Amino acid sequence: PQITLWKRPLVTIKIGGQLKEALLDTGADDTVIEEMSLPGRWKPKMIGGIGGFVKVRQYDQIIIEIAGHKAIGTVLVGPTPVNIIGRNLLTQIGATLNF
Amino acid sequence: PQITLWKRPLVTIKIGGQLKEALLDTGADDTVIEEMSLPGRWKPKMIGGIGGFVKVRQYDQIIIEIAGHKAIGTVLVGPTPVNIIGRNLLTQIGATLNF
Ligand SMILES: CC(C)(C)NC(=O)[C@@H]1C[C@@H]2CCCC[C@@H]2CN1C[C@@H](O)[C@H](Cc1ccccc1)NC(=O)[C@H](CC(N)=O)NC(=O)c1ccc2ccccc2n1
Ligand SMILES: [Cl-]
Numbered sequence: 001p002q003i004t005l006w007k008r009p010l011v012t013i014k015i016g017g018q019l020k021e022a023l024l025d026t027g028a029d030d031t032v033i034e035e036m037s038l039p040g041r042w043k044p045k046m047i048g049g050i051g052g053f054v055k056v057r058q059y060d061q062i063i064i065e066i067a068g069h070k071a072i073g074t075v076l077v078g079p080t081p082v083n084i085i086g087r088n089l090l091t092q093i094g095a096t097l098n099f
Numbered sequence: 100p101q102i103t104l105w106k107r108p109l110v111t112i113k114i115g116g117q118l119k120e121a122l123l124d125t126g127a128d129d130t131v132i133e134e135m136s137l138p139g140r141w142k143p144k145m146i147g148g149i150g151g152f153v154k155v156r157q158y159d160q161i162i163i164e165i166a167g168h169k170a171i172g173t174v175l176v177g178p179t180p181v182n183i184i185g186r187n188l189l190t191q192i193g194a195t196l197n198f
């Protein structure tokens with residue numbers, strides 16, 4: 001698809017068998033999802049957003065479908081108002097910005 | 100241009116007579132620039148993201164050049180660690196996300 005930006009670039013993702021809404025974010029280095037259960041061990045990570053730094057749980061090698069495109073990569077879990085798909089996964093689905 | 104997402108999508112902007120580097124940010128509703136003076140009226144605003152909220156000054160009808168493309172819109176000025184070009188100006192330069 002070609003997605004314009006007049007509204008938020010929200011898509012459906014599938015993770016852990018469940019469907020969620022998420023934002024395609026070229027400004028995010030990483031992918032951050034609201035509290036949910038994921039398999040395996042996690043590692044600590046501190047991420048910085050516009051209002052300051054927050055602690056999250058880093059899960060590696062997680063299967064995730066993004067607007068029907070399959071990816072397997074790192075997902076950060078923590079308190080966020082919006083699920084964010086960052087560049088680590090945008091590059092797996094072959095997304096570019098064009099003007 | 101086509102911009103890949105292997106790295107942060109940073110471009111040069113001209114704003115208020117100054118050259119700056121800024122992030123093309125599809126996950127930002129607003130354009131937020133580090134502290135600088137701009138002409139005309141402003142009003143206070145709180146904006147949020149990861150980590151909470153920050154107080155900014157809202158300047159309306161500000162011209163900006165983004166990678167060579169002129170646009171006008173609202174610009175927020177405040178203590179952001181990175182200058183961000185959000186959707187309000189990305190639409191004006193015809194930016195799309197493609198995959
Ligand atoms: C997600 C994470 C990996 C932490 N990356 C970032 O957060 C990087 C950090 C960079 C350095 C600090 C300055 C911002 C840039 C770009 N951001 C990405 C950037 O795209 C970020 C992602 C995001 C979206 C929605 C909610 C939270 C977070 N957007 C934002 O921070 C913008 C700022 C704005 N007012 O325009 N927020 C929003 O547009 C926005 C949208 C919906 C909301 C709902 C409730 C509360 C707040 C909400 N904020
Ligand atoms: Cl605007």
Ligand SMILES: [Cl-]
Pocket residue numbers: 004193
């Ligand atoms: Cl358009």
Ligand code: NA
Pocket residue numbers: 138139140158159160161
């Ligand atoms: Na003005």
